[PDB]
Amino acid sequence: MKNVGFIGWRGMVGSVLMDRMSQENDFENLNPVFFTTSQALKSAFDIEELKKLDIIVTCQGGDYTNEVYPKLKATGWDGYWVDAASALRMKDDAIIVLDPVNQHVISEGLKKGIKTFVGGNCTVSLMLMAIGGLFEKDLVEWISVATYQAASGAGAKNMRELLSQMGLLEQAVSSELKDPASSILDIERKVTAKMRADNFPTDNFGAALGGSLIPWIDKLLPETGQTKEEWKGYAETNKILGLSDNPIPVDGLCVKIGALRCHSQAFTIKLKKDLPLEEIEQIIASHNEWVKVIPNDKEITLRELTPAKVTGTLSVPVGRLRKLAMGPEYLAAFTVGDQLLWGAAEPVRRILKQLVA
Incomplete structure (x- = not known):
C-alpha cells in the first residue's frame, strides 16, 4: 500500500485528523509512518526518511513547511505533499483542495501532474x-x-x-x-x-x-x-x-x-x-x-x-x-x-x- 508519513499529528488540527481517520478506518488503506520534532518514531527533519515515502501529510505549520518542503523537493523527491498550513496555498504548482466542491479541478490537476495539495482557509x-x-x-x-x-x-x-x-x-x-x-x-x-x-x-x-x-x-x-x-x-x-x-x-x-x-x-x-x-x-x-x-x-x-x-x-x-x-x-x-x-x-x-x- 501507499507509504504515508504524518507530521504534527499531535497538534490540535493533527489530533482532529487522527481521530477522524480512526473513526473512518483510513489507516487500513495505507502504511502510516509517524514523525516528530522531539528529541525525547522518526525525525520530521530527516530528509532521507522523508524521501522514502509516497505521501507526506503535515499539520505542523507554515515554518516547518517552508523549511522542509523546498529541501525535500531539492532531492528530486517524486512524492505527494498534503499540507493544512497556508504556506503553499498560492504557489502555481499547488492546488487548494475541497473535493465536495472542486473535485473537477482536483482531477485535472492530478493529471497535469500536480504533487502539492493544500487545504483551504x-x-x-x-x-x-x-x-x-x-x-x-x-x-x-x-x-x-x-x-x-x-x-x-x-x-x-x-x-x-x-x-x-x-x-x-x-x-x-x-x-x-x-x-x-x-x-x-x-x-x-x-x-x-x-x-x-x-x-x-x-x-x-x-x-x-x-x-x-x-x-x-x-x-x-x-x-x-x-x-x-x-x-x-x-x-x-x-x-x-x-x-x-x-x-x-x-x-x-x-x-x-x-x-x-x-x-x-x-x-x-x-x-x-x-x-x-x-x-x-x-x-x-x-x-x-x-x-x-x-x-x-x-x-x-x-x-x-x-x-x-x-x-x-x-x-x-x-x-x-x-x-x-x-x-x-x-x-x-x-x-x-x-x-x-x-x-x-x-x-x-x-x-x-x-x-x-
Whole structure:
C-alpha cells in the first residue's frame, strides 16, 4: 500500500485528523509512518526518511513547511505533499483542495501532474460547502461577508484564554447573580470593570474576547486595506474554483467572537437572475450531502443554525434565506460550520483518501 508519513499529528488540527481517520478506518488503506520534532518514531527533519515515502501529510505549520518542503523537493523527491498550513496555498504548482466542491479541478490537476495539495482557509472553505450550488450554476456575481469567527482559528491557547475570560467575568458578580433582586446596572458595572482590569488575561488576543469582540484578524495589507484574513476571501475562493482569470468578487469584514470551534457568516449575495426563492433553495441543498437548508422559522433556526448545534459535527447548515430590500437579485444568507472539520482537517483527510486508493 501507499507509504504515508504524518507530521504534527499531535497538534490540535493533527489530533482532529487522527481521530477522524480512526473513526473512518483510513489507516487500513495505507502504511502510516509517524514523525516528530522531539528529541525525547522518526525525525520530521530527516530528509532521507522523508524521501522514502509516497505521501507526506503535515499539520505542523507554515515554518516547518517552508523549511522542509523546498529541501525535500531539492532531492528530486517524486512524492505527494498534503499540507493544512497556508504556506503553499498560492504557489502555481499547488492546488487548494475541497473535493465536495472542486473535485473537477482536483482531477485535472492530478493529471497535469500536480504533487502539492493544500487545504483551504476555514471561512472560505465553510462558505463554499454552504452555498456551493450558487457557484455551481454560476449565479454569483459578488459576495459581501461579515464573519463571526471562533477562537480555535487562532489556536489552542486562544480557546483556553476565552474560557478563562468568561470564567473571570461571571466570577466577578457571582454573588449578585444569585440574588434575584440585585441591580443589573451594578452587575454590569462590575463585569465591565473586571474585563478592563490589569489582571484580566488578554495576552493571546491582545484584547478582551469574552463578553466582547475583535474586528481584526491576522495582519494588515496596506495594499487594499484588508486584513490577510479578509483577503483570502477573494484570493482563495477563486483559486479553489479555478476562476483566477474570471475573478468573482468576495469580500467583507472578519470578526472574532466568543465561540470555541465554529465559524458563522452573514451573507449578502448578489445574484444574476431573479429566481424564485423556492428554487434558489433546492440549488443549495443539492450541491452536497452535508449542507443543510434551514427553513426561515424561529424555533428551528434557534435549534439548528447555531455553533452549539453544529460543533463537532460535519453538518453545514445554511438559513435565514430571503431576497434583500435592494431587489430580487440580492440574496441574504447565514451559515455555521465547524472550523476544525471542513475548515481544516476534513479536506485534508479527503484528498489523502483519494491518494491512497
